[PDB]
Design a protein around this nucleic acid. Structure first.
Length: 49
RNA sequence: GCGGAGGCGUAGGGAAACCGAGUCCGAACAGGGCGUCUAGUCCGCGGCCGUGGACCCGAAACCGGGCGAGCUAGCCCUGGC
């Protein structure tokens, strides 16, 4: 990518033919993100408490 | 994150031995009910359940241990009236 010595770089072959699955992509990704975040609080009563 | 041991299918059916897209009864080529493009598979979300008390508190009691007669008891010691 440089312009000093090296100069030139192209890609997309990966899979240009399709590329149209945005639905599920963003979705689930969003999911685990929520996980990591620590959420520690308690619940109380049951029988005695 | 790197990190394969753990599942459901990829068959069934049969007490089992074990046969097989077919199995089991029966002496039976036969009768008869259970077999085959059965895409499934794991996510979040959700039904909908299992333990969970899992909706909400609550009824007199049963179990354990602590408190317990500075009231009422009975006698027990001795002062009194």
């Amino acid at each position: 990518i440089p312009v000093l010595s090296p100069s030139g770089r192209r890609e997309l072959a990966a899979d240009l033919p399709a590329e149209i699955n945005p639905h599920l992509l963003w979705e689930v990704v969003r999911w685990q993100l929520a996980k990591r975040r620590r959420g520690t609080a308690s619940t109380k009563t049951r029988g005695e408490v």
